[PDB]
């Protein structure tokens, strides 16, 4: 599952 | 900065005349990512050729697999033709089943 650059 | 592709032309399975197989051209180690790859049958471009999605190695250089189903014979010659900015002229690598 991906990470999202917040 | 530019890195020229390493080129390998080969069959998925050991080649047996009259037996369906897959012909592969693996290009790796190159940058920039723009590249043109054709598979050739007796010097002519094979129409239906698929390729993997662009990915890259730990050193950031790109690799791609081009492939097509084919049934090798005794007489039919196969090759991979690659062009890239690092290349004066397209490089042709012939398939050598006897490797």
């Amino acid at each position: 599952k991906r990470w999202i650059i917040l | 900065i530019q890195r020229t592709p390493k080129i390998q032309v080969y069959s998925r399975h050991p080649a047996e005349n009259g037996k369906s197989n897959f012909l592969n051209c693996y290009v790796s180690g190159f940058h920039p990512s723009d590249i043109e790859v054709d598979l050739l049958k007796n010097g002519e471009r094979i129409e239906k050729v698929e390729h993997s999605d662009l990915s890259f190695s730990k050193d950031w250089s790109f690799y791609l697999l081009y492939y097509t189903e084919f049934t090798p014979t005794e007489k039919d010659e196969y090759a991979c033709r690659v062009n890239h900015v690092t290349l004066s002229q397209p490089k042709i690598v012939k398939w050598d089943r006897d490797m």
């Binding site: 599952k1 990470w3 | 900065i1 050991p14 592969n24 920039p32 993997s52 662009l54 990915s55």
Partner: protein, 275 residues
């Protein structure tokens, strides 16, 4: 054994030919399981392994949203990088990003990764501490300052120690039939005379998974590291990999040469000769 999850991303600008093309792929070990291509018909993240297909539509919706948002941030980042390097808008440039985690046989985190390259060169990398950055040049130092002020490393650490490991463990279970099976290499040696005085011995490894392998030639028991031709491990297209190693030998001395093969799928390293 140990396992890894990696997401790879490439954006390539093409001035005068539309917006940058964005391609991202996800891997567990050497198995592709998700893809996204901005030039596709109706771009969505697509499955590429059977064990990910069971994830629900919520999973695919979120993944596709993330992929599209990453394409947009990449476009912004490419414009920023032109400024950072005082470059023209005329040329094509490349932005690459990889992130992921490695876990041990127990599923424990071994380490996490998050790193970027511009035009094929190291740009900025999260350090193994998951708390500090290595910037390659004064341009990347600007990104470093920005990411430090935004506490990006703390957010990545939380992901890499949490969801990264947890979802890799989930994928490993759901795909255990394939992801946790090592296929050993099928091996043989071929002989091709070059001349009346020399011949090529080529040691072949075929049909193995995962890709990691060691092929070495010994002469009288001594590794021929300097004189061995070793091609890049290559994909067969059926999930397995291939590789060969070749040496040039004096004619008549073939039996002094031995090929040694090490692979996870082998209980013991193999020793082979030309028959």
């Amino acid at each position: 054994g140990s396992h890894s999850m990696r997401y790879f991303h490439t954006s390539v600008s093409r001035p005068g030919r539309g917006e940058p093309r964005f391609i991202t792929v996800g891997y567990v070990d050497d198995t592709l399981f998700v893809r996204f291509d901005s030039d596709a018909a109706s771009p969505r993240e697509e499955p590429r392994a059977p064990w990910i297909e069971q994830e629900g539509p919520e999973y695919w919706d979120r993944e596709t949203q993330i992929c599209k948002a990453k394409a947009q941030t990449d476009r912004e980042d490419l414009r920023t990088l032109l400024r950072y390097y005082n470059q023209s808008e005329a040329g094509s440039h490349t932005l690459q990003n990889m992130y992921g985690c490695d876990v041990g046989p127990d599923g424990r985190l071994l380490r996490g990764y998050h790193q970027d390259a511009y035009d094929g060169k190291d740009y900025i990398a999260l350090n193994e501490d998951l708390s500090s950055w290595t910037a390659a040049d004064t341009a990347a130092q600007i990104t470093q300052r920005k990411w430090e002020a935004a506490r990006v490393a703390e957010q990545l650490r939380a992901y890499l120690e949490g969801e990264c490991v947890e979802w890799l463990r989930r994928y490993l279970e759901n795909g255990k039939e394939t992801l946790q099976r090592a296929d050993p290499p099928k091996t043989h040696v071929t002989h091709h005379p070059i001349s009346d005085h020399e011949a090529t011995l080529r040691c072949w490894a075929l049909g193995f998974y995962p890709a990691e392998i060691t092929l070495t030639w010994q002469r009288d028991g001594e590794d021929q590291t300097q004189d061995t031709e070793l091609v890049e491990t290559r994909p067969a297209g059926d999930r397995t990999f291939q590789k060969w190693a070749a040496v040039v030998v004096p004619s008549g001395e073939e039996q002094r040469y031995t090929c040694h093969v090490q692979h996870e799928g082998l209980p013991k390293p193999l020793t082979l000769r030309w028959e």
